[PDB]
Amino acid sequence: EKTNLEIIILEGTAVIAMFFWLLLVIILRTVKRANGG
Amino acid sequence: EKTNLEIIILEGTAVIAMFFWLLLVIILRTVKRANGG
């Protein structure tokens, strides 16, 4: 019943921290893939 | 050793709740992008 609390902070921080990563990942990839002509 | 249990419900609910979201997200986008001609 208590663990649930962690499930909320984990479920959110999970999909959250992920998006944050996949975000800077797409940006870094979008940039590196823009140094060409 | 016990926390693991939560890791199973979290690991699953994590990738699960995620797909569920990205799912209704692609559907809502696929629909809104289908109201045109």
Add this chain to the structure above:
Amino acid sequence: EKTNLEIIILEGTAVIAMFFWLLLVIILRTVKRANGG
């Protein structure tokens, strides 16, 4: 304060186990989509 520890193993194993899956998923799709000419 302690739960955090699990948040580290969960947050990582979360985005980790995920990539691992989406990985073998893209590979299987990349392969099946390579048996053609």
